[PDB]
């Protein structure tokens, strides 16, 4: 378990600026109302934010492999950020969706790489995603 966990993270902090700028541009594909007006990315610095959040929850869920599993993530945190999104009008399903593309694009690189019977890797990215999006 914990050399694939290792194994896993180095393939994420390798292909970590890709598999944002991958999951992003499938994001705005899915949900284009965030590069209009009102969206969570329309200006540059928006954007800019958008994909240093998504860069964030990457993050933890790397280390959240690495360490075990999502008890490390802290929930009032999480629960933290839900509230802020819905109040600073950052959409909490994209947020989400977002996420689980994230893990999505993890999941190809480690088959394209060779490792099969990778069902722990959903972990951080479900908890996340779970926590984001409960009301
Ligand atoms: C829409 C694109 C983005 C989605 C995918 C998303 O997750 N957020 C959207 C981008 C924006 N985030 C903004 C402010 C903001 N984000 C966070 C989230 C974290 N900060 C952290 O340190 C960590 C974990 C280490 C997380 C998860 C916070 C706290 C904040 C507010 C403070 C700040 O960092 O600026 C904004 C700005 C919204 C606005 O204009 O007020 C966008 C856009």
Redesign the pocket.
Known sequence: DGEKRVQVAGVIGTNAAEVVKTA?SQ?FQEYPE?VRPG???YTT???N??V???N??L??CSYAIVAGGASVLDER??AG?RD??NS????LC??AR?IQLMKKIVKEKLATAGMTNIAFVDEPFDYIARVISET
């Open positions: 992003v994001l965030l969206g969570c990315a610095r928006r954007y934010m958008c240093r959040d998504m964030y929850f993050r933890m945190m999480l950020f802020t999104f600073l009008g950052i959409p994209p947020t977002s």
